[PDB]
Amino acid sequence: VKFSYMWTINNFSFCREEMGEVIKSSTFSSKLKWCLRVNPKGLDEESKDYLSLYLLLVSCPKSEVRAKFKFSILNAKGEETKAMESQRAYRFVQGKDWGFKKFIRRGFLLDEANGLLPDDKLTLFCEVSVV
């Protein structure tokens, strides 16, 4: 079953999150509930120069599901760019997240000349395929 979520994070340049701090999206579905989570300053010292991006299984009545996923950024022209796809379907349990600790370099994303923060909005697009 394949579905998607578009997450707009407004006023992205005003984010005060420090390394390890997280923002979660609203939940979305295709009884399963998913959300996205971003670490604007990464998780640890190795990733503090990047935004980290994860898919989280928030609610699941089964013990586990398997899902592949793809994240991309919608640019100022409304087009997908800088996509990263999971290598395979990963096993999720409720509370488990999978994703990319080094999804996008902050010094690239935050320079507005690259066109990824139109009106200071970061727009992320996620596709999920549950096996």
Q: What is the DSSP string of 68-99?
A: EEEEEEE-TTS-EEEEEE-SS-EEE-TT-EEE
Which residues contact residue 14 at a Cβ distance below 8 angstroms, ignoring those fewer than 6 apart? 120
Resolution in A: 1.5
Breaks (C-N over 2.5 A) in the chain follow: 30
CA dist., res. 107 & res. 122, Å (int): 14
Scanning the structure block, which residue is given the tokens 């488990």? 96
CA 126 to the chain's CA centroid: 7
Technique of determination = X-ray
Q: How many CB atoms lie within 10 A of CB 65?
A: 20
Q: Which residues pair with 129 in a beta bridge?
A: 2, 68
CA 35 to the chain's CA centroid: 9
For the chain, what are the domain ranges?
1-131
CA 118 to the chain's CA centroid: 18
- Which structure tokens are listed for 73? 């950024």
CA dist., res. 32 & res. 130, Å (int): 10
- Which structure tokens are listed for 4? 């998607």
- Which structure tokens are listed for 117? 């923060």
| Under 8 Å between Cβ of 35 and 27 | yes
Q: What is the DSSP letter of 110?
A: T
CA 5 to the chain's CA centroid: 10
